[PDB]
Design a protein around this ligand. Structure first.
Ligand SMILES: O=P(O)(O)COC[C@H]1O[C@@H](n2cnc3c(NC4CCCC4)nc(Cl)nc32)[C@H](O)[C@@H]1O
Ligand SMILES: O=P(O)(O)COC[C@H]1O[C@@H](n2cnc3c(NC4CCCC4)nc(Cl)nc32)[C@H](O)[C@@H]1O
Ligand SMILES: [Zn+2]
Ligand SMILES: [Zn+2]
Ligand SMILES: [Zn+2]
Ligand SMILES: [Zn+2]
Lengths: 521, 524
C-alpha cells in the first residue's frame, strides 16, 4: 500500500511574485494568490505530513512577466532550486530564447533533472547538450524507486525557436520504448510528465503501456472534484481516469496554470507497482497560506532590477482590460479590440491605397489581463505581461478566399481553449458552430479603404485586402498555413509592445468595449 | 398674357462665398459652386433678357458659416441689398440671435420688405417692431401690381429664440384673411412666400384660396423637371402642381438650399390675374457662371475679419466627414459618430469613481449637423471648418433617463421618417434597429446600450425600468425637435461645455481622425 504524494505545477509562466486571481500584477497584497514563496510554504507543510513526496513541473516556466524579460531563465533555475523540485519536463516556451537561451540559464543551472523523451538532438549539438536533459530519470522515493519519462509538444518548432537541430518526435512513439527500458530495469512505478496538453495526456495514458500516472500542462487545464475554490470552471474530475487499452485505470492530472493552484494527488501502489487508489485535488494557493519569509526576502532581492520598468505610467484604463484566455480564446475580448485598434491607429497615423482598415490577432497571443482598480494606472510591466513575446505587427495583403480560410480556421476546433481564435480590428464576423468545420462563417463584413466614407461591406472572395497582424501569424503560426502560403505581399511592422505603448501614451485614458465585432448564432 | 419671372433662393444659411458642391468650404475655386457674386451675375443676366423679374428669399439667410458668427446678420442685410432682392419672408433662423439680433442687424438695415403674416407681435415687443416686418407687401411689377404674403414655421419657438412676446399662428388661418384683404384691394396676382417646408407649402397652395404661386424653403427641397445638373435627387417636378380645393392648379417651388441653385419660374397670367402657364427649373450656379467683380471685391473686403479663424489647424481627417442632411437625417452618418465620440471622450477623460460619474451613451439630432467636411485639402481641419458643422453655440449636456424615456425618444426619432426631419438621432455607444414597416411608435425592434455598471463594457438590451446617463446637446435636453419627453421625464440635468470646443479639443487630441459607419443605427 506504498503511498506516493505527487505535487505539481504547469505553465507557471514567470509568475514568481504573488498575483491577482486573474494572474495579473498584485495590487491588494492581502487578497493576492500564487507566488513561489507561498508555494514553498504549502510544499513544506505537505513534505512534513507526508512521507513520499515528489514536486514536479510539466514545463512552461519560461515567458510571461518582466521576471523572464530581464533574468531570461536564471530566475526559473534559482527559485525552482530553492523550492527543491524533484523533476521538470520541457515545455515549448523553454525554447523561446533559443537553445543557448535554455542551455546557459536553465539546463546548466538546474540542480534537478530536466526531461523530454521525444526531443532528439542531432549534429554537433548532441555532444554539447549531453545529459543536460534526459528522456527519463529514475528517482529514489524512500525505500522504493520511481521512474519519470518526459515529453514535449510536437508543435514546439511552430510555437517557439528550438532551432533546426532538434527533432520533435510523436510522443507515444518516442515514449513506449523508454518505458519498456525502465520496465526491464525493474522500474514498476512510472509517471509520464510532459507538455503537450490534456487531449495528448489522455492518449499517453490510453496508449503508452506501463504508465501509472500522467502529469501534464500546456492546455492550462483545471481539473477538480467537487465545489471549485475560485472562478475556474473544471473540464473534468481530478484526477481524470483514463481506461487504458491494456486494462488499467490511469489517473491524468493538470494544475490550471500561472502557479495559482498546487496539484495534489495521493496514490496507493501495490508491491508490483500498480495503482489501487488515486485521489486528491489542486490546492488553491492564497492569502490563507503565508509566503515563506526567506523566499519572499530573496524574491525582493531579485525585484531591484525589475523596479526600473514599472517606474513610468503610459496611461490609465477606466475599464477592466480583459486579456484572459477564457475570454480572448472563446469570444470577443476588449484587450483584443484595444490591441487591434492600436495597430490600425499606428498605421493610419502615417498613411485609398496605403490605408489599412483590417486587423487579425490570435487570441492565444494575448498572454495577460490588466486590472483597472489601481487608480486606472498602466505601466511597461503591465504591458510586458500582456505581450511578452517580442514580435511585431506586420502588414500583409490577402485575397477574400485566404481571409475566409483563416476565419474558418479560427473556429475549426472551437471549445478547446485553442489560441488560433482571432480577435479583430475593423472586421465584423458571425459564426454558426452548428455547421460542419470549414463552413462555420455565415457572415464576414470588412471595413473599406477604396471608399471616401468607410463603411462595412460584405467580404469579396476575389478582392485584395490589407490586414495588420502579428508576425507569428504572417509566418503561418497557429496553423494559418494559408496566410504564409497564399499571402500576396508582406511588409514587416514595429515591435508589438511599442505599438500598443505608443497608443496608450496617445489616448491617455482608454475604455475598450465588447461591441459585436465577433458574433454567434 | 402678362409674364412674371420669379427668381428665388431659400435657406442660403450664411453661404456668402462660393462653396464645394456639398456646400462646404471651397478648396478648388475652379470647381466651386454658388455664392452671392455668382448669383448676382445670373440674376443681372435674367433681368436684362426678361421684363418682369422678382428676386425673393424664403428665409434662413441667418446661421451656417463664420460669416454669420462674426457679422451676425449685417452680411445678410449688406449683400441682399447689393443683389437688390424685392422681398424676403422670415425664416426660423432669423430669430437665432433673439429679436434684437433680428431688429438691429437685418430689419433696420434691409432696404427691401421683410415679411411674415402669421407672426403676431404683442406687448412691449409690438411697439419696438411696428412695420419692421409686414404680413404682405404690394409690389409694382411694370404696368401691373403683385401682392406677396409672408409666413414663418409655427415651430420657430421650438427651433430658435424668438422670445415670449411673439405669437406664431397657424399659417392657413393667418394667411387667408390677408389674401382676402388683398383681393378687396384688387390685387389679382398673389404669391405666398414663406418658411414652413414643402408639405406645408403644398397645403398653403391647396387650402389658402386666391394664392396663385407658393414659394418656399425650410425643408431644403430640390425640385427638377428632367435630368438634374448635380448630386441632388428631386422630390418632384419643378414646379410642383397642387390641385387646390377651389379648382385651380397652384405651382409650388423650392430652390434646394445654401445658394447652390437659383430658382426660376416663368408664369403666364391672364387679365384676371390667374395662372395659364407655369414652367421653369432651378439654375445650378456652377463654375460656368462667373463671379461679378464688384460683389466679389466687396466679399473680399468683409473676408479680412474672418481670416483670423481658419489660421490654425486643429487636426486632419483621412476620411470624408459626411455631415450632409441627406445622410445624417436618414441613416447612420460618420459626422454623427465623430461628434458623439468626442462628447463621450470629453466626459470620460474627467470621470471614474465606481460605476457612477461614467457615461456610455450619446444622442444627437441629425438636423443639428449643419455641414460636411472634405478630406481632399491635405486632410486639414480649421475652426472655420468646424464652425460650419456646429454653428449654433450650444453645449453638450449630461442628462439622466429612464429606459422608457430613452425608448420614447428613439420611437420619436423615426415617427415621421422620410421627410428630411432633423429629429432623427445619431448615437454614441448605442445599437438601435428600426423596422419602418411597423406603425409609428412601435418601430424600434432592438435597442442595446453600452453598460457602465460592469467592469467590461458590453452592449446589453435596454431596460425600461433602469436609469441611464446620456450626453446630448442642450437643444435636445431643453426638449427641442419635439423631444418633450426628455425635458418632461428627465431625472437630472447638468450642463456641459461649448459644442465646438468639445469637438475641437478631441480633434486636437486624436491628431488624425477616421470615423466610420459601423452599424450603430440599422434597418430591417
Ligand atoms: O502556453 P502555451 O503552450 O503557449 C498555450 O497557449 C497556446 C497558444 O499560445 C500562442 N502562442 C504560443 N507561443 C506564441 C508565440 N511565440 C513566439 C514568440 C517567441 C517564440 C515564438 N507568439 C505568439 Cl503571437 N503566440 C504564441 C498560440 O496562439 C497558441 O495557440
Ligand atoms: O434648420 P431649418 O432650415 O430651419 C430646418 O431644419 C430643422 C432642423 O434643424 C435643426 N435645428 C434648427 N435649429 C436648431 C438649433 N437651434 C438652437 C440654437 C440657436 C437657437 C436654438 N439647435 C439645434 Cl442643435 N438644432 C437646430 C433641428 O434638428 C431641426 O429639426
Ligand atoms: Zn503555457
Ligand atoms: Zn505550453
Ligand atoms: Zn434652413
Ligand atoms: Zn428653416
Amino acid at each position: 500500500m506504498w503511498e506516493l504524494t505527487i505535487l505539481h505545477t504547469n505553465d507557471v509562466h514567470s509568475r514568481l511574485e504573488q498575483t491577482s486571481e486573474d494572474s495579473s500584477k498584485c495590487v491588494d497584497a492581502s487578497r493576492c494568490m500564487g507566488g513561489v514563496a507561498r508555494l514553498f510554504t504549502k510544499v513544506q507543510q505537505i513534505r512534513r505530513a507526508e512521507p513520499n513526496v515528489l514536486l514536479l513541473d510539466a514545463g512552461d516556466q519560461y515567458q510571461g512577466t518582466i521576471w523572464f524579460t530581464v533574468y531570461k531563465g536564471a530566475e526559473v533555475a534559482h527559485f525552482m532550486n530553492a523550492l527543491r523540485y524533484d523533476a521538470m519536463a520541457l515545455g515549448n516556451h523553454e525554447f523561446d530564447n533559443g537553445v543557448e537561451g535554455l542551455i546557459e540559464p536553465l539546463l546548466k543551472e538546474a540542480k534537478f533533472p530536466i526531461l523530454s523523451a521525444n526531443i532528439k538532438a542531432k549534429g554537433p549539438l548532441a555532444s554539447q547538450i549531453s545529459g543536460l536533459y534526459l528522456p527519463y530519470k529514475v528517482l529514489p522515493v524512500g525505500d522504493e524507486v520511481v521512474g519519470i519519462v518526459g515529453y514535449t509538444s510536437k508543435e514546439t518548432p511552430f510555437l517557439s525557436n528550438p532551432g533546426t537541430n532538434l527533432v520533435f518526435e510523436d510522443e507515444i512513439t518516442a515514449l513506449q520504448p523508454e518505458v519498456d527500458k525502465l520496465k526491464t530495469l525493474n522500474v514498476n512505478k512510472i509517471i509520464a510528465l510532459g507538455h503537450s496538453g490534456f487531449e495528448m495526456d489522455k492518449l499517453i495514458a490510453q496508449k503508452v503501456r506501463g504508465v501509472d500516472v500522467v502529469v501534464g500542462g500546456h492546455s492550462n487545464t483545471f481539473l477538480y472534484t467537487g465545489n471549485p475554490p475560485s472562478k475556474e470552471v473544471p473540464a473534468g474530475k481530478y484526477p481524470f481516469i483514463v481506461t487504458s487499452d491494456d486494462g488499467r485505470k490511469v489517473p491524468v492530472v493538470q494544475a490550471y496554470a500561472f502557479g495559482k493552484y498546487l496539484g495534489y494527488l495521493k496514490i496507493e501502489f501495490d508491491e508490483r507497482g500498480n495503482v489501487i487508489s488515486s485521489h486528491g485535488n489542486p490546492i488553491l494557493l492564497d492569502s490563507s497560506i503565508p509566503e515563506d519569509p526567506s523566499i519572499k526576502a530573496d524574491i525582493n532581492k531579485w525585484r531591484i532590477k525589475l523596479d526600473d520598468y514599472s517606474t513610468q505610467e503610459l496611461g490609465k484604463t477606466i475599464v477592466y482590460l480583459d486579456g484572459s484566455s477564457q475570454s480572448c480564446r472563446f469570444r470577443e475580448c476588449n484587450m483584443g479590440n484595444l490591441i487591434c485598434d492600436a495597430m490600425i491607429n499606428n498605421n493610419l497615423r502615417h498613411a485609398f491605397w496605403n490605408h489599412v482598415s483590417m486587423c487579425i490577432l490570435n487570441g492565444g497571443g494575448i498572454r495577460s489581463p490588466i486590472d483597472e482598480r489601481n487608480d486606472g494606472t498602466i505601466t511597461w510591466e503591465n504591458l510586458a505581461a500582456v505581450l511578452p513575446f517580442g514580435g511585431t505587427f506586420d502588414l500583409v495583403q490577402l485575397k477574400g478566399s485566404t481571409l475566409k480560410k483563416a476565419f474558418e480556421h479560427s473556429v475549426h476546433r472551437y471549445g478547446q481553449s485553442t489560441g488560433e481564435f482571432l480577435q479583430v480590428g475593423g472586421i465584423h464576423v458571425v459564426y454558426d458552430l452548428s455547421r460542419k468545420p470549414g463552413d462555420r462563417v455565415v457572415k464576414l463584413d470588412v471595413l473599406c479603404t477604396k471608399c471616401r466614407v468607410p463603411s462595412y461591406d460584405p467580404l469579396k472572395m476575389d478582392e485584395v485586402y490589407k490586414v495588420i497582424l502579428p508576425n507569428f501569424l504572417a509566418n503561418g503560426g497557429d496553423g494559418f498555413q494559408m496566410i504564409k502560403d497564399e499571402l500576396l505581399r508582406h511588409d514587416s511592422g514595429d515591435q508589438d509592445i511599442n505599438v500598443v505603448s505608443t497608443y496608450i501614451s496617445k489616448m491617455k485614458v482608454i475604455y475598450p468595449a465588447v461591441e459585436g465585432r465577433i458574433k454567434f448564432s
